[PDB]
Design a protein around this ligand. Sequence first.
Ligand SMILES: *[C@@H]1O[C@H](CO)[C@@H](O[C@@H]2O[C@H](CO)[C@@H](O)[C@H](O)[C@H]2NC(C)=O)[C@H](O)[C@H]1NC(C)=O
Ligand SMILES: *[C@@H]1O[C@H](CO)[C@@H](O)[C@H](O)[C@H]1NC(C)=O
Ligand SMILES: *[C@@H]1O[C@H](CO)[C@@H](O)[C@H](O)[C@H]1NC(C)=O
Lengths: 84, 15, 375
Amino acid sequence: TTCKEDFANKNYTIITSRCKGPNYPANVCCSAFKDFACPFAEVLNDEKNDCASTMFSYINLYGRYPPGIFANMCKEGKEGLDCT
Amino acid sequence: RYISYGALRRNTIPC
Amino acid sequence: DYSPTEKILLNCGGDTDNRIWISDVKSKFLSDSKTSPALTQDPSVPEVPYMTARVFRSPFTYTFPVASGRKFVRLYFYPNGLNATNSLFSVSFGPYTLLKNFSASQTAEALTYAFIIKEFVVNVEGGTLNMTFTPESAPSNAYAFVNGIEVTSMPDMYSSTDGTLTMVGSTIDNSTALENVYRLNVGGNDISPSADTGLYRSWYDDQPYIFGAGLGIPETADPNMTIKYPTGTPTYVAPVDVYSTARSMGPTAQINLNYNLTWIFSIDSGFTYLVRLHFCEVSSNITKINQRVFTIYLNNQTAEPEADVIAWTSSNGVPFHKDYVVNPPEQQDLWLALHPNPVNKPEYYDSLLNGVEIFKMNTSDGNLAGTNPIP
Ligand SMILES: *[C@@H]1O[C@H](CO)[C@@H](O[C@@H]2O[C@H](CO)[C@@H](O)[C@H](O)[C@H]2NC(C)=O)[C@H](O)[C@H]1NC(C)=O
Ligand SMILES: *[C@@H]1O[C@H](CO)[C@@H](O)[C@H](O)[C@H]1NC(C)=O
Ligand SMILES: *[C@@H]1O[C@H](CO)[C@@H](O)[C@H](O)[C@H]1NC(C)=O
């Protein structure tokens, strides 16, 4: 189910200029990721779509990020990341 | 609204 | 493996796991009941012994002839002409009440399981045992039932009498009763009771208990790596499939500094909990001390400041385990988490876990029963 939204032409600076360095500070990086992907919480959260994987692909491509930093260090509560 | 952990698990590390 | 002298698999009213059962109909075990087959069939559910049940209109007591020793005792329930919701009862043994005010349905579908298995570890003196099922008199509707019963011989595997070996994270086990609430193969697959090391324990994958998306990676032993139990150690402590598979934080050190590898287990309050953690260094890279050192936190507090599996074992691929006691702060979530300890400057910043076993310890002498799970 190819993603409804287009992630190729989005502006990833939100993340790239904040989540950085040899250390990937959890608070800074998760703030940046939320800022970028909270406006598409609806489509990402839908299991049927091909979008979340496509997004992470682009995030990790433009940032040259290590393999699972967002899944691993971004956690808030049982519900997920708040995004409001 | 939230970013669900199911979406985050799409960032799971591979082999 | 371990061969238990007694293997009483009892099916009520009479499998997919190569174990033969026996009806309770003409059993010497039976000491009235209204046997009935199950009203509805769920493909996920196996007929034996779930399909057949025996129902206790009034108190019933079961007896089994057993040598002096400790036994696994496992009840099998599947919530189902009576109405399923109205089944509330208690189960007792000796001076131990195993279950009270128990609902199979409210328990089972709060947890999104079709059927339930409940496990206990109990010590028996004498050649007989007390298994009594009592429909709760408190509401009149209330009845009792059991799909099946297993009694299995067992070594004294999970006791820590030895002096000062165990203290809570802030303790003595002897002729206390334990109820097993979780038994996980961390980073590995499910293990059916056949595939256990002769004690017929079910091991479950740990992943449904990871807190967020933070799964790290699973590791398996290399093929040219041999899991060797230490000389003079029982080899039935946990299957080799438990120690050959583990979970760790990932290939990036600074990432592993910023998160905990965490698991959460819903538990009954008012009790104290035995947590046996299972370790074995399966990585080819880790062969010396001060390569992988990590801190273990139980219930947001430190149980182990620096866990070096090599210091615990001196070599690759050799199993080990350690018992802890958690006393929760008075139906509740129990947290387990690991983090790397960089003090002393280890080669890698990582953490590891191979298996988990959590038991509820009987309070004083008395209850092992907790509240019914609100869904
Ligand atoms: C340990 O830490 C967590 C918080 O990190 C404790 O608290 C709850 O956390 C959940 C997230 O699962 C929130 O939804 C709840 O609102 C939090 N409630 C409270 C009261 O904190 C958790 O309870 C702690 N456990 C112990 C035993 O200390
Ligand atoms: C991304 O958005 C920011 C706004 O904060 C803007 O300053 C920046 O130039 C944008 N980058 C690109 C490549 O469009
Ligand atoms: C008794 O069981 C009922 C459910 O049938 C439950 O609502 C109630 O909280 C329980 N009370 C005690 C003391 O177990």
